[PDB]
Amino acid sequence: LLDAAAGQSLAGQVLSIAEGVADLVPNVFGLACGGSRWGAALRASASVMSLSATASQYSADKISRSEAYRRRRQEWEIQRDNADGEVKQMDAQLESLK
Amino acid sequence: LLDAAAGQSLAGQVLSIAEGVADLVPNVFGLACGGSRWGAALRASASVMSLSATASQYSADKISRSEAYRRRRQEWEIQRDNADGEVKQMDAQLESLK
Amino acid sequence: MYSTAVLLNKISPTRDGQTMTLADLQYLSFSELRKIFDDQLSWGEARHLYHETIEQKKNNRLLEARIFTRANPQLSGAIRLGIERDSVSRSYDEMFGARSSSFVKPGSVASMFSPAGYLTELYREAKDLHFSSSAYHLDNRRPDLAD
Amino acid sequence: IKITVMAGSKTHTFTASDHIASLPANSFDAMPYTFKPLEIDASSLAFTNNIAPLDIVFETKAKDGRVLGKIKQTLSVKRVNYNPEDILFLRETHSGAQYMQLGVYRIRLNTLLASQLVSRANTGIDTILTMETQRLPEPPLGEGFFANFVLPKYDPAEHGDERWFKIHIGNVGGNTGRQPYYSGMLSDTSETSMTLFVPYAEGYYMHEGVRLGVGYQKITYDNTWESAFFYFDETKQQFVLINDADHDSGMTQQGIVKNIKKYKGFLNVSIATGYSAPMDFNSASALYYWELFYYTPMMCFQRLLQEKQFDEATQWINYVYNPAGYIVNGEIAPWIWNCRPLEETTSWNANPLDAIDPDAVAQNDPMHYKIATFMRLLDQLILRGDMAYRELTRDALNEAKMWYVRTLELLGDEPEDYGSQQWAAPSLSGAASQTVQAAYQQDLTMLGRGGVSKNLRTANSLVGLFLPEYNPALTDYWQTLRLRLFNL
Amino acid sequence: VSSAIKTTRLAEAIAGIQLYINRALNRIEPNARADVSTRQFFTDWTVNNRYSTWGGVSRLVYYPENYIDPTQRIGQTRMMDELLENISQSKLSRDTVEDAFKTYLTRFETVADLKVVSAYHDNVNSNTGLTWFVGQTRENLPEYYWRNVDISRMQAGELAANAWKEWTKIDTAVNPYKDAIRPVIFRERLHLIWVEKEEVAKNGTDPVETYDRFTLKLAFLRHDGSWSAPWSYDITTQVEAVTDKKPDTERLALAASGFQGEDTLLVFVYKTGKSYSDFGGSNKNVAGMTIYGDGSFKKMENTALSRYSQLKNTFDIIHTQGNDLVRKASYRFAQDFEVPASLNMGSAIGDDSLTVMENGNIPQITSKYSSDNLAITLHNAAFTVRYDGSG
Amino acid sequence: LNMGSAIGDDSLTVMENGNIPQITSKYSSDNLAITLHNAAFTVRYDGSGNVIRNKQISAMKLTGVDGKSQYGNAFIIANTVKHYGGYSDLGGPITVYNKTKNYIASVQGHLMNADYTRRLILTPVENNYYARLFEFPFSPNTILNTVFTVGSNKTSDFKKCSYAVGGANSQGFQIFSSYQSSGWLDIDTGINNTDIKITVMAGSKTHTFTASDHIASLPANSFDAMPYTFKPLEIDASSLAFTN
Amino acid sequence: NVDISRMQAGELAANAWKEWTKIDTAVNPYKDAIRPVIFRERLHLIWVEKEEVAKNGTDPVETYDRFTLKLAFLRHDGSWSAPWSYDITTQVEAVTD
Amino acid sequence: VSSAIKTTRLAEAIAGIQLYINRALNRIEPNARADVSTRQFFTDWTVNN
Amino acid sequence: YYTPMMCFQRLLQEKQFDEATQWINYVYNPAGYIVNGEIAPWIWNCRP
């Protein structure tokens, strides 16, 4: 799901750029004309920067939790190995006891 | 509450699309006419992508915290079993002592 | 774009006076089929016969599975209330007798999934990996395997 | 050194003597040959379904006779066809049904089930996942009528060596010949009854009306007045069966005709009046239908089971299967499985073995979904008993026994091994024999269409084949129940 | 080996044959039959080389129920994946599952209530190939989906359910005029083409006159499933011409056809009628555009317009018996027959591993149907012979 | 209006797909007219799943020795049947006695051995060959689902014979398989068209429509599905008790 | 909503009533022209909206009121759909003179 | 069962009737009355068992 | 070259041995490569 979130964040960069291009076209006509949003392109480039940062943060969280699960498994393996040694030690004590 | 947050994030997608449709219609009239927001539809599609990403992150947190509680309970089960063995072991030691 | 009946006719007979059937080509790869029948078949015809053979192979496998699934003695069974015997199931039993009901426990040599079954499949396909002229032929280096 | 092409019956050959642009340097290293443009008269190609093959061969042989290299290839030539009766078009009836038509055949494209689910959802979801909702009718695909056909029991004397049957359609469009319309298999125990939809348009039916006849091979009932004839009566404004019996005079598409004979092959043919067909679990909407009525309840059952919500899980799995039946209108329903495609065993996947997919196999034979659902119910019962067993109280132990006994009563008595001791041990080469494999596959292919068993019994000494194996998961259920009852 | 290790005769035979197969397939022992080593059994050697994995794939056909998972399945709908996420917690109330199911029903209604609006068949005839559809939602929102079906599977008008494909949502901000949106395939990938109508006025006129501007848009599906930024073209002159300056009272119609032989996209704009005459000259009811591989366009003249007249049988028409609209699927265009533009022969090994034939191909294949005979020309057919053994 | 389905007597027959697709109204003058269009339902011989379903219907479905049909005849069948003994549990001889033609139809699932001689034996003891009251050899030795032509009226003898035995040898005795009988039920499969009726009540008035008069097309007379579709039912609803 | 079939002699039990539920769909009706309605077996909300518009290309610029009818329905999960819109200006001017 | 396990007369009667109800509702014993098996007690058998 | 190798290493690091083999076979396979139903003459499937 976190990987999907990062992909969805990046999926809006193309649309944001297209919006800036579209809003550069004048939109009022007659004997009062104009209406272009001059900074529409600049806002679009600022938006793709924000989406890039958001996608990076989602991707970093995905990897961070993944490696946390891996180190958690490594601790479980040591616990398993300790318990296996416990059984072997006690089976040898049975030989001593008898 | 996290599940509610994810649902609310997705609940704004329909409204975002409708806003882009509504703002495509020209809004100034007379002998100087126009006023359509050309990139309104493109912005709406970009917005739902962002809302989709936010909902995905909220859902991921809900599931991650839920499984954390489950692994926490599994550790409690091992602790309970260890304590049960302690009592049984010490009751066997009492027979040896007497 | 071809007719499988005509293509089988173009290769018939299969050295035994019979109309070469699709089941007889189980059996050999597309490269084998193109090489052995390089004279009678074009590239498109070889592809058509190979594809039709595989589809016949899959359908026969499904038909056997359909019969065995309903003939399983384990499902009698409150689930037997919703099990119906097909007409093809009765025709199979008239031909093969008690075969459809001769289930074996896992771990028996007679099972189709037993190590003996795996060994049969390995031997069937690896038998012809070398020509009979070669000392590397399976039946030459180890003549005991065939018996 | 020649290039040869085959276009139907004509064969063109181009050799290095005549059609070489520039000969390459004569050496042991790479010798690239490039040819002049090859002009091919492709006018005798066998066009089957508007496509024809072109065979091209590159061959170079030394004077030894060795093939220095041979490459075979086939080219596909496709004929453009924009004839109106061969062009796909889309229509939408006033009832809301969308269908795509290619000549005679019409295929439904959409679904209208969503509107009828709203009223069901006004009550609980118990009303949505019912047999009644799964049998809801769909509007017809444009103008036409529904006709009921009944076919006889299989009779080798009348039908022939094989039990299959084909139904053909007659005077539609401009084609007067037989077009395939439906296919199936005769039953050896009872009759087979079907309801087909025949399309209609103004001027669409030819002289005497449409034909619907049945063929069997060794006979094909499409002589004069042998197929069923239908026409649309402009006066009564309804469809009429022309030849339900012998008639010295009757009205048809082209006015009155004289000698009308009853149809042959069918036991009975009639017109279903006001009939609407229930929704098809093999249509273009089959994926969404299966998810709504089977896949979703089983997913909710599994998740609740994994969280030990046993009572809530039972409610969800009872939407598809319940051994105690289903209460509809205050009565026990006659059907065994509440999921309609399972009760009717509706296949909706024609190529399950194209890839390794257990679900695809189960979609081809929904019988496996019956077993899978049945085993899931056994899993819940055993888990219920195990948790009750662990509470250690007398009431808990009695509850555990109840669950285990109910599980054992659903399974029944486990069977013995029947085929192991009668199995003759073959040699390794005998089991891998190609003749044994081919003989068995021949019987399976014949069985897939016919059922011929001349010299019925297969002479038990004629077997080196392996035998089916019991399901290890089911035998584990019996093994578990035996151990639990022993300890109790 | 030491005498301590034990085995069985069948187990040892399996081990021996497995070793022999590995040596033969990996070219370790010479004179291995290259034709036999390509059997389906040896292609799947990654799972047939072990008794455990071989048994797994063989039992799947007979006992698939041992591998069915009610939570994952090949083909699971996105809405089903959403439902699984909503009940992935550990505390599942009865009401919580009901609420999650109601969310699933909301998605189900949206997809179920789709209605097909246009179709494209990716072949020169209706005998083989895939038919692509575009759907529209009942809700008052410009949401569009797409799917396809393989009709080469068809037998007597019946189609297996697996021949169909899931509805997939288009996320690219499409706002088409009326129902003028349809799919098309060229450059071997799915494209979406539609027209949009906006209200504009001419600048510098004292009587301010507003007019409708018609824009043709074209976008394609990218490798990861996203949609590209659309190309836009002005087709106002063509729209007014074919509708007799009455776009409101007539039905503007759009048709797109892929001319793969020339790597071009043919776009037609026409007035919906009952029948259509040939294109160009006296017929002003049909206008056309040619879109090239890089997005440029060339408005069609009368000479080029007449070249595609037979495509009129794929246009939408009005039924004579009652004014019922009958849409028709557009088709890929070819002159008279479609023949592939090239064929690569590949390579082949000569006798005794002494010679090899290399780099065989026919770069150009053309067609010519004059009178009633078809001529096929193979240009620059070539191959190379060389003395070489395959390693 | 969707009627639904219903289970018949003795779990022998079922009624399916009953509904009225269209219902119209008309208030002309001061009387209300209700029309039920295309009312239909189907009757089919099918048990809801038991021994009665699989093996007794299939016994009746067999073609008679006089030639096919057997539908519309009277039968006597066992209420509950169970496997009792024998070498193996085959499908088990499930015998049905045809009263109107004096036939005995037996049904099996599998046979033990093709070469060994097999016949039918009906005996009230099971292990006593010399207590039998019926015995018929199989017309082919390798066949199930046949009919045997008792010849006389021996219903009383048939009711005496429990323990239907299908092994039936004298190579010793050699009981291959046998089944129990429990109780006995009498059924007639003949249907009268005047008894297939739809009846409606509107206050004090009662309308009755049977298959004899108001049927559009009569269905094929067979053991399988028989769908009846009626002509439009015109109902005079002017005596309804309108409460609130 | 309330179930009035429960009514006995004009008295209504409290459980026959239903909780107030908030509508979240951006409704801006003109005056009090908003009401519920049931068709297709689900709750719909229908209302009219008033906007101030002028006719293009007229030297005396004349403003007029534009009336739009909106219709939305409650979906399965409790959300509201995008409203259908129709122009009813001619009907409004006719009936209100 | 072994002689080690104990019970009471009422407890054994409850266990016996529960076993009979399960067999009757699940179509394991023939001639079960389908009309009686739809009583409110048996519909709520998920909590009355 | 670089992308199939990267996928091989990641699958190998996660012990997905069968999937890793499929990716590394895009560049090297000792058993050859099937092209047009025949074993290809080249030893390495990566052209450079």
Numbering used by the authors:
A (entry chain C), B (entry chain D): 2148 to 2245
C (entry chain B): 1 to 147
D (entry chain B): 1514 to 2001
E (entry chain B): 977 to 1367
F (entry chain C): 1319 to 1562
G (entry chain C): 1124 to 1220
H (entry chain C): 977 to 1025
I (entry chain A): 1807 to 1854
Original authors' sentences:
Of these are a class of multi-protein ABC toxin complexes (Tcs) that have multiple receptor binding domains on the shell of the A subunit (TcA) for recognizing and binding target cells. The Xenorhabdus nematophilus TcA, XptA2, has thus far only displayed toxicity to insects. Here we report the high-resolution structure of the Xenorhabdus nematophilus TcA XptA2 by X-ray crystallography and cryo-EM, each at 3.1 Å resolution. XptA2 forms a 17.5-nm-wide, 24-nm-long pentamer with a molecular mass of ~1.4 megadaltons (MDa).
We then used our 7 Å map for iterative MR-SAD phasing to successively locate the selenium atoms in the X-ray diffraction data, which resulted in the final electron density map to 3.1 Å resolution. During the process of refinement with full non-crystallographic symmetry (NCS), we observed that a small domain of chain D was out of density (2mFo-DFc), which was confirmed by inspecting negatively (−3 σ) and positively (+3 σ) contoured mFo-DFc maps. We determined that enforcing full NCS except for constraints on residues 1363–1506 (RBD-B) produced optimal refinement of the model (see Section 4 and Figure S3). An examination of XptA2 crystal packing revealed that RBD-B of chain D is packed against RBD-A of chain E of another molecule. A direct comparison of the X-ray and cryo-EM structures revealed that the break in the five-fold symmetry of RBD-B of the X-ray structure results in this domain being pushed slightly inwards toward the shell due to the lattice packing. One difference between the two XptA2 structures observed was a slight shift in the positioning of RBD-B (residue Ala1310–Lys1591) in chain D. When compared to the cryo-EM structure enforced by 5-fold symmetry, RBD-B on the X-ray structure exhibits a slight indentation with respect to the outer shell. This subtle difference between the position of RBD-B on all chains is likely due to lattice packing during crystal formation. It allows visualization of certain degrees of flexibility in the domain. This dynamic movement indicates a “pop-socket” interaction between RBD-B and the XptA2 scaffold. We observed Arg2190 from each protomer orients to create a ring of five inward-facing arginine residues at the second narrowest point (2.7 Å) in the channel; the transmembrane region at the tip of the channel creates the narrowest point (1.5 Å). Unknown density was measured in the center of the arginine ring, apparently coordinated by the positively charged amine groups of the five arginine residues. We expect the density corresponds to a counter ion in the crystallization buffer because we do not measure density at this position in the cryo-EM structure.
